[PDB]
Design an enzyme around this catalytic site. Structure first.
Site, PDB file in Angstrom:
ATOM      1  N   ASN A   6       0.895  -1.199   0.000  1.00  0.00           N
ATOM      2  CA  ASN A   6       0.000   0.000   0.000  1.00  0.00           C
ATOM      3  C   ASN A   6       0.916   1.227   0.000  1.00  0.00           C
ATOM      4  O   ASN A   6       1.798   1.386   0.882  1.00  0.00           O
ATOM      5  CB  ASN A   6      -0.800  -0.053   1.291  1.00  0.00           C
ATOM      6  CG  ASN A   6      -1.505  -1.394   1.429  1.00  0.00           C
ATOM      7  OD1 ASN A   6      -2.536  -1.561   0.844  1.00  0.00           O
ATOM      8  ND2 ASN A   6      -0.941  -2.356   2.203  1.00  0.00           N
TER       9      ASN A   6
ATOM     10  N   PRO D   1       5.082   3.544   3.104  1.00  0.00           N
ATOM     11  CA  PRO D   1       4.497   2.345   2.505  1.00  0.00           C
ATOM     12  C   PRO D   1       4.208   1.310   3.565  1.00  0.00           C
ATOM     13  O   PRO D   1       4.996   1.133   4.478  1.00  0.00           O
ATOM     14  CB  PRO D   1       5.567   1.928   1.450  1.00  0.00           C
ATOM     15  CG  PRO D   1       6.136   3.274   1.033  1.00  0.00           C
ATOM     16  CD  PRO D   1       6.205   4.066   2.291  1.00  0.00           C
ATOM     17  N   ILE D   2       3.094   0.634   3.419  1.00  0.00           N
ATOM     18  CA  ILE D   2       2.778  -0.522   4.339  1.00  0.00           C
ATOM     19  C   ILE D   2       2.713  -1.801   3.532  1.00  0.00           C
ATOM     20  O   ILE D   2       1.907  -1.865   2.548  1.00  0.00           O
ATOM     21  CB  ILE D   2       1.440  -0.287   4.981  1.00  0.00           C
ATOM     22  CG1 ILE D   2       1.628   0.924   5.924  1.00  0.00           C
ATOM     23  CG2 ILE D   2       0.985  -1.533   5.761  1.00  0.00           C
ATOM     24  CD1 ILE D   2       0.364   1.609   6.416  1.00  0.00           C
ATOM     25  N   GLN D  37       9.200   5.228   7.445  1.00  0.00           N
ATOM     26  CA  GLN D  37       7.888   5.283   6.765  1.00  0.00           C
ATOM     27  C   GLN D  37       7.516   3.893   6.222  1.00  0.00           C
ATOM     28  O   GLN D  37       6.516   3.766   5.497  1.00  0.00           O
ATOM     29  CB  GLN D  37       7.886   6.276   5.615  1.00  0.00           C
ATOM     30  CG  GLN D  37       8.095   7.754   6.069  1.00  0.00           C
ATOM     31  CD  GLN D  37       8.284   8.651   4.815  1.00  0.00           C
ATOM     32  OE1 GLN D  37       9.390   8.842   4.320  1.00  0.00           O
ATOM     33  NE2 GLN D  37       7.192   9.126   4.290  1.00  0.00           N
ATOM     34  N   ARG D  39       6.573   0.024   6.871  1.00  0.00           N
ATOM     35  CA  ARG D  39       6.149  -1.022   7.829  1.00  0.00           C
ATOM     36  C   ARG D  39       5.827  -2.329   7.087  1.00  0.00           C
ATOM     37  O   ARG D  39       5.336  -2.297   5.961  1.00  0.00           O
ATOM     38  CB  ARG D  39       4.895  -0.560   8.569  1.00  0.00           C
ATOM     39  CG  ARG D  39       5.262   0.525   9.590  1.00  0.00           C
ATOM     40  CD  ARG D  39       3.981   1.246  10.060  1.00  0.00           C
ATOM     41  NE  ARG D  39       4.399   2.068  11.207  1.00  0.00           N
ATOM     42  CZ  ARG D  39       5.196   3.122  11.085  1.00  0.00           C
ATOM     43  NH1 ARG D  39       5.556   3.626   9.922  1.00  0.00           N
ATOM     44  NH2 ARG D  39       5.566   3.776  12.202  1.00  0.00           N
TER      45      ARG D  39
END
Lengths: 61, 61, 64, 64, 64, 61
Positions: A6, D1-2, D37, D39
């Site tokens: 994401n 970003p995840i 930023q 994860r």
């Protein structure tokens, strides 16, 4: 491995392509799987669709 | 905490912003984490992209 | 609305139950939906299964 | 970003830790974001919980 | 296609295997893809980890 | 059951509707749940947002 990434909208096609190459190479090296066993799905988030501490990216900007 | 919220398309920016504030406040109170430890991702679903009992939202409407 | 909440392991059932009620009512009020339209799924992450800046929560705890 | 990474069960902690570092640095370099930023959440799948062409990884192992 | 199925805990392996085959063939037929392009990931939810209208499946079972 | 289906962009509304019907029928039969207990969310992926072995669908095409 199936990877969902994401990330905020705004990135050019080159940068998305560089990211899926580099993340695939990392997974292939570190987990010793074949490239075709690594699938990456990119979910792009609009700036009103991502928040930290209750403020959207749009608001933080 | 990382929260993904899937909801049907149609909501105004105000309503999305009110929702990410209110859900963040709920997580901060109930779990005693800092605001910056709460991230919310909103995935909006088109009316043909959400179904209950085999009918899309579009069909139900 | 369908909400997935990813949390580190270790929280007490009471806190999870209070979060689920508080999140649900937050969504009902701000999105103008009924309670029965709000589902939450909780995914607990082991400390070896969550990372920030390339270190897992296990290693970050270990270093402190 | 995840990043959510779904893996079959059974990998050693070291390999998971090396993946988390390598993926993070891949994202930092190619997306021009800071480490803090980035994860990653790891979800392990039991062999009865992953399928290709309608057979679970358990059944595929069993047939070999 | 990649399918994630979130289920409450407790189903027998046979039912999970029948679901994985039936879902796969549903996708193959309706989406005109080969079986080997269809992956399903099953995530089981503990009864304390799923809620409708702000009550967890555990509490809903308890109240009945 | 809550089912998320990620599939490449390009499919017509008929085909998405046929898929959510058929997958619902499969879940209802195999798990013996009611239709209204089955929810399907469709996430469509752009051809630059899905990769296998480090190449996006666009590149493979």
């Amino acid at each position: 491995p199936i990877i969902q990434m994401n990330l905020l909208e705004g990135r050019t096609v080159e940068q998305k392509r560089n990211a899926v190459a580099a993340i695939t190479e990392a997974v292939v090296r570190t987990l010793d799987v074949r490239p075709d066993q690594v699938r990456i799905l990119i979910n792009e988030l609009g700036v009103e669709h991502f928040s930290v501490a209750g403020q959207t990216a749009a608001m933080r900007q």
